[PDB]
């Protein structure tokens, strides 16, 4: 997609600094609009970041921190909106880039030399921050009050100039010292200090060089169509103040007709539907969680809806990071009770060391592995799953065997939907898992963990931008040294662990949750019928024949005959005498025929027929 998520990493070090560079090479690959923050952190001088060239707009802020790159490939960035801000104050932050005076000689030790943000035309909220970048030139010769939006001049700025090197002047082809950088490509744009009076925007000094009111990042022609980025919405190349309404009204009655020319609101845009993992809402918002008194429903096209509870809504179970558990860092002895029998979770799940070695001063108990059984009902998670400790008695993640999907609408550090770190364990066992709705999956420092290369990660994602990220685990050469793999019946060798209960799809048949070579149609005593590759008993009257069987479906009339007696149509080991009525007629003393038919008696009581022609009905 041309739209991607931003991140939330704000001067935390990477959970794997080694595989951090390639995480960004997936997440931002050819992205044009960032739904979040653009963070560039701890990136070394060798970093081929050229895939960032396509970013046109950021809805959050930009943070470029602690990097040893000489330059940043961001020359296409038109504008930043500041829907979030760094320290609630800043929309562009440049921190601590180069080296902090280590014991290291290298003549180009990184640090950003220049601005080179050659497109940046507007900032709609928040200030600018630059600190401890001793390599940086030209940040001081900028008219930042052209770029700060005229109608929201929250123009705080804190810029460092403590250089440890010289700066020569920018190319004299510029109209004075107004530059991004050193070359004749690198002149600063002006769009507000070359304009006057009613011209809130222009491309030049004339009244014809002015731009339309909806146009933030400048214009080419004078019309609302002619514009390089727009202040409120883009709809189909029209710069609209609002998205078009989804309803038409009577104007007096306010009786309502749906409008097919309506759109939903999503980021900087108006769209006719919400993208795959989001929620559609009655008022036309595309969201992550439903509004209060709206439920997330299983809408027909899979594109979920938030529609209205005409009774009080069902008490769905919150995960960590939502309502009841927003601030709550961990599953513990106290909140594990709140998941008992829950099948969809509204939030995330997290296992830290402190989840299991629970603190007696913050008076919680250490966690028993048996308390984890409360999750075995779980079908779906709206947030993420994070694991950084596990009990040494569990070689696997068995309590999640029934989990189909993790959405990642909430993400760990804004980026990750599944984390499995430092756990030691040998396999995963997640047999039902078939979807990762958004965000990356991280699996690192796991001592014995085999078979992670056998999972068809292809089938779980819904964009070309997500990957599995792995390092410091078990060698897969030492997994063939263990002599084990996925089982013979695992389709293309795809599994979650060792044996017939672990395959992602089965080559032959399913006996309950066992993938098997064949089923007991002929080959044994407990006979099993086939139901579209599943295998099941009847009620036990498919009596073993030498080449056939006796009741196919568990409505016991269906393979060929009966084993001992018939009560038409069904089959039994004895004609029965029930002592509960509903209506005042029990099965009256059903005598066997010679072909075993269980026939009722010909007089109501008193006179004859008790199977032995005796006395066993009352009166």
């Amino acid at each position, epitope marked *: 997609t041309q739209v991607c998520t931003g991140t939330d990493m704000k001067l935390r070090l990477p959970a794997s600094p080694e595989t951090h560079l390639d995480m960004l090479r997936h997440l931002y690959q050819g992205c044009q609009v960032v739904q979040g923050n653009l963070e560039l952190t701890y990136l070394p001088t060798n970093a081929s970041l050229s895939f960032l060239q396509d970013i046109q707009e950021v809805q959050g802020y930009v943070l470029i921190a602690h990097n040893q790159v000489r330059q940043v490939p961001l020359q296409r960035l038109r504008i930043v909106r500041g829907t979030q801000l760094f320290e609630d104050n800043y929309a562009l932050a440049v921190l601590d880039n180069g080296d902090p005076l280590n014991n290291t000689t290298g003549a180009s030790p990184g640090g950003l030399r220049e601005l080179q943000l050659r497109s940046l035309t507007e900032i709609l909220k928040g200030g600018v921050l630059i600190q401890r970048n001793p390599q940086l030139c030209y940040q001081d010769t900028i008219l930042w009050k052209d770029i700060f939006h005229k109608n929201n001049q929250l123009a705080l700025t804190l810029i460092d100039t403590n250089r440890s090197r010289a700066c020569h002047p920018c190319s004299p082809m510029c109209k004075g010292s107004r530059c991004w950088g050193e070359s004749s490509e690198d002149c600063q744009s002006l769009t507000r200090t070359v304009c006057a009076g009613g011209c809130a925007r222009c491309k030049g000094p004339l009244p014809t060089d002015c731009c339309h009111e909806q146009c933030a990042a400048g214009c080419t022609g004078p019309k609302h169509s002619d514009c390089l980025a727009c202040l409120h919405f883009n709809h189909s190349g029209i710069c609209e103040l609002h998205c078009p309404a989804l309803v038409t009204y009577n104007t007096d009655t306010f009786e309502s007709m749906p409008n097919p020319e309506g759109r939903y609101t999503f980021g900087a845009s108006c769209v006719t539907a919400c993208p795959y993992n989001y929620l559609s809402t009655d008022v036309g918002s595309c969201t992550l969680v439903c509004p209060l008194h709206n439920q997330e429903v299983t809408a027909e096209d899979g594109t979920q809806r938030c529609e209205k509870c005409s009774k009080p809504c069902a008490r769905v179970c919150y995960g960590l990071g939502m309502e009841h558990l927003r601030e709550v860092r961990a599953v513990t002895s106290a909140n594990i009770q709140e998941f008992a029998g829950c099948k969809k979770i509204f939030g995330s799940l997290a296992f830290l060391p402190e989840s299991f070695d629970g603190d007696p001063a913050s008076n919680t108990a250490p966690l028993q592995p048996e308390q984890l059984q409360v999750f075995e009902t779980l079908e779906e998670i709206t947030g993420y799953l994070y694991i950084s400790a596990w009990p040494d008695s569990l070689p696997d993640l068995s309590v999640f065997q029934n989990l189909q999907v993790i959405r990642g609408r909430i993400l760990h550090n804004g980026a990750y939907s599944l984390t499995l770190q430092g756990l030691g364990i040998s396999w995963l066992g997640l047999r039902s898992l078939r979807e990762l709705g958004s965000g990356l999956a991280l699996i690192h420092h796991n001592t014995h963990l085999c078979f992670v290369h056998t999972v068809p990660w292809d089938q779980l994602f819904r964009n070309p931008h997500q990957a599995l990220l792995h390092t410091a685990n078990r060698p897969e050469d030492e997994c063939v040294g263990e002599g084990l793999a996925c089982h013979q019946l695992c389709a293309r060798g795809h599994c979650w662990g060792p044996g017939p209960t672990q395959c992602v799809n089965c080559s032959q048949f399913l006996r309950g949750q066992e993938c098997v070579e064949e089923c007991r149609v002929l080959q044994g005593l407990p006979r099993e019928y086939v139901n579209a590759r599943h295998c099941l008993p009847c009620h036990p009257e498919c009596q073993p024949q030498n080449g056939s069987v006796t009741c196919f479906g568990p409505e016991a009339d269906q393979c060929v005959a009966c084993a001992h007696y018939k009560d038409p149509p069904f089959c039994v080991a004895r*004609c*029965p005498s029930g002592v509960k009525p509903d*209506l005042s007629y029990m099965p009256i003393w059903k005598f066997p025929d010679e072909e075993g038919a269980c026939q009722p008696c010909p007089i109501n009581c008193t006179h004859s027929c008790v199977d032995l022609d005796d006395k066993g009905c009352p009166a």
Partner: nanobody
Amino acid sequence: EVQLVESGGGLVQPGGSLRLSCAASGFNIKDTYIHWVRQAPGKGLEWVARIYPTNGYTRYADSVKGRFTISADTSKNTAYLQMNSLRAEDTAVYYCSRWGGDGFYAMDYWGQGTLVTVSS
């Protein structure tokens, strides 16, 4: 007597769907199959489907095999026929009935019925 009540019969397009509904009275569905049956108007009968509401087992006739599905709410004393891929060969007066105790597969309790029609 013990008795039922049919509902949800009506007029439909061919190829379309209709959901019939049948509630139970004088008993509560646990020793139970619930059936659907239909009459060619003032002529022959045809049996359509059964459900056992106490475990969800279902069976069908060769005319509605792979077209229709029978279903129930075993708490709300009610069973349903989900008819789909409808035909002119479905214009009939529909009826619902019971069995209970398998040695008595004879249909004693029923409701008032409802018409079903399929047309342009």
